[PDB]
């Protein structure tokens, strides 16, 4: 079965990302395929590499990075949502003229058509939000 996971909230503030992650690990481990993980709304905030979370608790960003690494997951961040909230990569930094970037290399910025794209290709569209 092919999955498509949509995440609408930022890390720690709402459980959504943690739930989505637990779901993705369990699905992946069962042999299922995760076509794409798409972050929207505050969800895009799960792609910054600038977090320094309490060491005695989970590191949501790095966790997603590792799962992505292991199973070669395509994790997409909505550009418009990223622009409004501050998620910047090479491209954006250049085009928007920022003096720095903060996106974690395991995540890529792209258009919202990547989310609709996923919904069509995957068998199931699971959304985790508020």
């Amino acid at each position: 079965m092919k999955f498509a996971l949509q995440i609408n909230e930022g890390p720690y503030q709402h459980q959504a990302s943690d739930s989505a992650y637990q779901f993705a690990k369990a699905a992946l481990e069962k042999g299922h395929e995760i076509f794409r993980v798409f972050f929207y709304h505050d969800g895009v905030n799960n792609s910054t590499r600038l977090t320094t979370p309490p060491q005695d608790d989970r590191h949501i960003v790095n966790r997603w990075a590792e799962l992505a690494e292991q199973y070669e997951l395509d994790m997409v961040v909505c550009v418009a949502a990223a622009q409004r909230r501050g998620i910047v990569d090479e491209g954006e930094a250049s085009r928007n003229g920022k003096d720095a970037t903060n996106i974690h290399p395991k995540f890529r910025i792209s258009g919202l058509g990547q989310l609709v794209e996923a919904a069509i290709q995957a068998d199931r569209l699971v959304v985790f939000g508020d």
């Binding site: 459980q15 959504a16 779901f23 369990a26 699905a27 481990e29 069962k30 569209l125 985790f128 939000g129």
Partner: protein
């Protein structure tokens, strides 16, 4: 055919109500995250939740019950407890997933 998912407290949001109102015969409902509290026996919504057992298949995510201080024993008889591996299966058994936020 439809696996509904409610992630919010029935004492804080109207999401549980709206779900129970539109979910139809043979559909599944999964209470997770803060939506767990609706599966606990003895609450103000016990009866309406129990009522739904009639035409619906109700599930509650174990991980979240325990996280909030509740053993499966504290659950309303009839509501099946599942873990993430179970969550996954529910999304594959049904034909579609509808999130009630």
């Amino acid at each position: 055919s439809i696996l509904h998912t409610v992630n919010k407290s029935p004492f804080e949001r109207n999401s549980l109500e709206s779900c129970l109102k539109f979910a139809t015969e043979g559909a599944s409902v999964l209470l997770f995250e803060d939506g767990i509290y609706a599966a606990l026996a003895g609450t103000r919504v016990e009866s309406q939740v129990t009522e739904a057992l009639g035409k619906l298949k109700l599930y509650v995510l174990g991980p979240d019950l325990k996280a909030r201080g509740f053993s499966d024993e504290r659950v309303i008889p009839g509501i099946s407890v599942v873990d993430y591996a179970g969550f996954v299966d529910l999304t594959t058994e049904c034909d579609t997933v509808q999130a009630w936020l």
